[PDB]
Amino acid sequence: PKVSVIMTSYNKSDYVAKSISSILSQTFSDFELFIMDDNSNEETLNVIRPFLNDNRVRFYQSDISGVKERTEKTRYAALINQAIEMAEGEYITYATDDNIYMPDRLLKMVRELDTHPEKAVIYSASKTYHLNDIVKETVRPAAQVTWNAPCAIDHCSVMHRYSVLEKVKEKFGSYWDESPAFYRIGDARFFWRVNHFYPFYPLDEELDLNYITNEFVRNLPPQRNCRELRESLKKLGMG
Ligand SMILES: Cc1cn([C@H]2C[C@H](O)[C@@H](COP(=O)(O)OP(=O)(O)O)O2)c(=O)[nH]c1=O
Ligand SMILES: [Mg+2]
Ligand SMILES: [Mg+2]
C-alpha cells in the first residue's frame, strides 16, 4: 500500500469505533491500518473486534500489564516504533483512538506529497469540538512552513515520507523516543528529532478532529517539556 496508518489504542471504548470507522471510510483507500492496542479492557477490545474483518487492518495487541510495565517506556512510542518496522507504505501517518479523520484527509495529503517531491513532511490544520452540545470550537491552523514543530503541531495532523524515518534513525538510534521522560509529549519529541533535518509543510485545511468535554502518574520520571524542546530547536537555527 501507498500509505501506512499507525493508530494506537488503549481503553477508549466510547471513542475508538468512530476513530477506526473514519479511517476505513477514507476516499483514498490504498492503505494499511495498524491498530496497535496496548492490552486494553474487554469493553474496548469488543468495540474493536468487528473492524478486524476489514482486510486492510493489521491488529496487534501487547501483553503489557501493571504500573511498572506501563511506565517503563513511553508506550505509544514503543508501539509506533513496532508498527513502523512492519510498515510497507511509502507515506506514513498517525492516528489515535479518540481522533477522527475527515473523509478526504488521506487523498489530500497523498496528493500534496505526490505533487511536491521537495516536501518530506506535511501537516494539516486540526479542530477540536468542546461538548457540554457544542460550546467551544478550537482550530490549530497550518499557515506556515515550520522548522519548530514541537508542541505546535499534533500527533494526528502529519504525514511524511518513509525516508524521513531513515534519517532520524541514523542520527538517534530509534524512530520515536521511548524514554518515559517524554511521556506527556511524545509526539513533540519525535517532531524534535525530525526538525533536525526537515521542516514541516502546511496544508491549510482542517483534516482531523477531536471531541472533548493516580498510581500511573506518580510512577513516571520528571517530565521534560515543550519550551525545552522549542528552545533547543531555536538554537540550532535550521530556519
Ligand atoms: C497510557 C497509554 C496510552 N497509550 C496510547 C493511547 C493513545 O492512543 C496514546 C496517547 O494517549 P492519550 O491518553 O490519548 O494522550 P492524550 O493525553 O494526548 O490524549 O497512547 C498506550 O498505547 N499505552 C498506554 O499505556
Ligand atoms: Mg487524547
Ligand atoms: Mg497531546
Side-chain angles (χ1 to χ4, degrees):
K2 190 65 174 210
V3 172
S4 298
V5 182
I6 302 174
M7 172 201 279
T8 49
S9 165
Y10 182 56
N11 288 346
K12 288 190 186 93
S13 57
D14 284 325
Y15 304 79
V16 71
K18 174 85 167 153
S19 285
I20 294 166
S21 178
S22 81
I23 298 164
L24 302 178
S25 69
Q26 290 289 303
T27 46
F28 181 89
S29 58
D30 190 17
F31 66 77
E32 66 190 343
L33 170 59
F34 292 96
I35 300 178
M36 314 294 292
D37 183 79
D38 214 14
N39 213 11
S40 292
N41 59 37
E42 178 178 16
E43 182 160 354
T44 293
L45 292 190
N46 282 283
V47 163
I48 287 162
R49 194 168 310 283
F51 290 104
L52 311 192
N53 295 288
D54 180 307
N55 49 69
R56 298 162 300 175
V57 169
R58 300 181 63 179
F59 178 72
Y60 293 86
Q61 184 186 344
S62 78
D63 227 328
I64 294 289
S65 189
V67 78
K68 179 166 103 72
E69 289 195 336
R70 291 253 172 241
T71 60
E72 187 84 12
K73 322 170 174 165
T74 291
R75 288 302 315 148
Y76 56 81
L79 292 176
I80 289 171
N81 279 348
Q82 242 165 263
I84 279 164
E85 221 143 38
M86 290 183 295
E88 306 209 302
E90 181 189 355
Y91 295 158
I92 297 310
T93 193
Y94 312 95
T96 66
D97 49 348
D98 55 10
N99 177 266
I100 289 157
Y101 278 14
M102 294 293 294
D104 295 318
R105 183 183 186 270
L106 290 186
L107 176 55
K108 290 183 163 172
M109 292 185 123
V110 164
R111 279 181 167 171
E112 188 77 14
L113 289 171
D114 275 358
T115 285
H116 297 277
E118 75 275 9
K119 299 172 166 180
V121 182
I122 59 166
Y123 78 105
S124 85
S126 188
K127 180 143 61 50
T128 297
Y129 282 109
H130 289 76
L131 307 158
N132 161 139
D133 344 348
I134 304 183
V135 300
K136 248 173 41 178
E137 271 187 10
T138 295
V139 171
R140 286 196 178 258
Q144 92 183 27
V145 169
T146 181
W147 276 95
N148 208 323
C151 297
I153 295 172
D154 184 70
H155 208 106
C156 308
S157 294
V158 309
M159 175 179 285
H160 59 82
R161 302 182 188 283
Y162 182 93
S163 58
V164 168
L165 293 181
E166 251 82 305
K167 253 285 247 294
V168 162
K169 167 105 157 132
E170 264 302 314
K171 207 227 151 84
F172 294 102
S174 59
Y175 302 112
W176 282 51
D177 191 339
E178 305 185 9
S179 155
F182 290 102
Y183 224 118
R184 322 280 322 189
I185 49 164
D187 58 338
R189 183 63 161 179
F190 172 57
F191 294 165
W192 179 86
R193 298 181 164 184
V194 168
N195 265 160
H196 282 51
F197 307 113
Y198 304 98
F200 280 53
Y201 287 93
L203 195 169
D204 204 15
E205 258 185 273
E206 277 153 50
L207 300 182
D208 81 88
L209 148 80
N210 308 294
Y211 278 108
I212 103 192
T213 69
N214 172 13
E215 74 161 341
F216 171 83
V217 165
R218 72 183 190 207
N219 275 282
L220 295 155
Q223 293 304 291
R224 270 132 101 178
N225 59 27
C226 299
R227 289 214 196 182
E228 179 184 319
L229 290 175
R230 296 190 55 81
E231 275 301 301
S232 161
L233 285 189
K234 287 159 158 189
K235 162 122 162 216
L236 222 50
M238 297 299 297

